[PDB]
Sequence to fold (733 residues):
Amino acid sequence: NITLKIIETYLGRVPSVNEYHMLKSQARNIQKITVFNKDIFVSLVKKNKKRFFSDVNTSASEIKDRILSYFSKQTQTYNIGKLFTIIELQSVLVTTYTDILGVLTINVTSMEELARDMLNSMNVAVVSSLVKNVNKLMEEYLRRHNKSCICYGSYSLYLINPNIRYGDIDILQTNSRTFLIDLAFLIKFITGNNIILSKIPYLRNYMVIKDENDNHIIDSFNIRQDTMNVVPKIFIDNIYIVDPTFQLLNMIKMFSQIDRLEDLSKDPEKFNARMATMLEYVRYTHGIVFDGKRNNMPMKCIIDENNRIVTVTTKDYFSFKKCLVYLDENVLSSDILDLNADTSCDFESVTNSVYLIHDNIMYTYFSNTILLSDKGKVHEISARGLCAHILLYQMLTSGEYKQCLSDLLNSMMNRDKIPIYSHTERDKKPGRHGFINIEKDIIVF
Amino acid sequence: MDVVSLDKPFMYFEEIDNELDYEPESKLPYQGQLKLLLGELFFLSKLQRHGILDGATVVYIGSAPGTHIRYLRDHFYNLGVIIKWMLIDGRHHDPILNGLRDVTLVTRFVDEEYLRSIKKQLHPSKIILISDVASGNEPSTADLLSNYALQNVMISILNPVASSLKWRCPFPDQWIKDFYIPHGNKMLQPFAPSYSAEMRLLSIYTGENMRLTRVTKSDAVNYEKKMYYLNKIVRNKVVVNFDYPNQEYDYFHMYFMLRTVYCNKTFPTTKAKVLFLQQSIFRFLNIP
Fold:
């Protein structure tokens, strides 16, 4: 009965029999939207433009029309599909903006020679205006939302070494889809910019917004609440940052990817800043002994060039002797099933692989290229990269990691740049590029 | 009396330790909704756990009315997981599925022609197939072959990254010919008919490397034997060492499935979550 009106008081017209059928199921969401004061809303986007968007060339009438204009384009739009797409996006405002963006208005130098030492040990390879106008908006988010947003990247070390330059804020959120939408609705009403929310397939749970000219504004990685806990965190300026110890461990697993090497090729000094800021954190934080002398670390990483499975020896550190590291995640997931395994430990983005200790054997997937020293000889950084990976698991399950790290660190001091003889090839990740585009009323996944 | 002190339920067919001779002499409202919802949560949760379910499309062939699917649709939505749902069945679906932007509903009968048509449409997004084609009484051994036949085609045309199909071996006494079915683990089903051999063939592919396994009549016999055991002797026990409101084997079996399901909410123990989930599922289906 009221569905009849609900749908009519929404479309700015009389609901057609065709429409009354489809929309009928959204009688509650369309109502909850109509009954939603579409004004105090205009009061909040404004009570933001002046708090994080001062430098904005637009009258408070634009950041008032754009709004109301969207909120009633059901009248102009008669297409059944574009409605469903404008109905699910309007709803993201009516229920989360408040709890999401609304709330928004209520040392290392002494290790430079160290990162310097190491980076070169491995040296063997071969953006809109809002970008900045936004980072300011996010600094607040990190505070206002401690448990629905964790930070890392460059900006994380910045809260550590106020000398670690940041021009982007990388974060993890247990709701980054609700998050990213509201902010794209923000960058719109205020700027008038038509941002595009795109989702990259070869990346586990990833969505990023960009501007009309295809320029990266801000991205985000998503994680289960589950994962949001086991992720080692550190509290700073009222914001949790992915503990610098973990972040650093994940950087050895970084240089194992040929690319990063090629990145550090054309700027061997780039990571000195970030990398030392970190070898300086661990040295203190967990009194790490730094001396060229520290063997037993580069573990016997016999690689089987056929089954694409590096075989790592960890027996001298963990109860589980080996740890079959796979290179093809589609395979591992299958073999694991054959093991009748039902609870492999997944941490999503954080590790980009799952871990299964089935019978003293740990099975896992390496998400980068395996660098070699020679023909079937797993290059040193790759041997450390793999190793570093295994240790990420420990940190997420609160186990033995301390010492191994040390041994791992020292292995990288004062070494002979072993060239890149060759490397393995990443497994292809399926999927299609998905995306939401408010303007054209387009949602595809 | 007739109780038992198990360590874990039989999750896969392979795990059945005994067997008994099929003796021809052989509940809860909405069980054949529970059997399905509990198997698809397990499967798709398993996927999500190995990151295959991430932003992929789940195609369903033989999904009507598939009331339960609404629940599945919602469980995952709430979990932040982004999925495209495509349900195709010769017949119509339960209206609760209409109006979902993330759910497309085809109402036609499939075949070669069509499978080649949707793959074109869906590409390059990965596909996750869930086959439950049907052919009341008992389907004929000839229909089982014709069905398992088709399902293998869905696999070739669609080239799915992972699949979940029906698998009930033809009765030895009613054998016709042999055949091949995808390589996969035969997942046993909770709250399934008292004397059903039907299981779920969960399989994860590697693309360029397909694998089938020849089913024979020798095999068909070990199917009837082991399954009839599971049904007559196993699912009739009481897990005395299972600390849970219900101790009937299935409840103990359904426990082990959900424990592997993710929920963003927080709970003191697992028993706390399983009991929550169950409590929710049995709620949606309307089981007291």
In short: The interface with chain A takes residues 11-12, 14-15, 46, 49-52, 54-57, 79-80, 82-84, 95, 98-102, 123-126, 161, 184-185, 202-207, 256, 259-260, 262-266 of chain B (CB under 8 Å). The two ends of chain B are 28 Å apart (CA to CA). The CA atoms of residues 12 and 187 of chain B lie 5 Å apart.
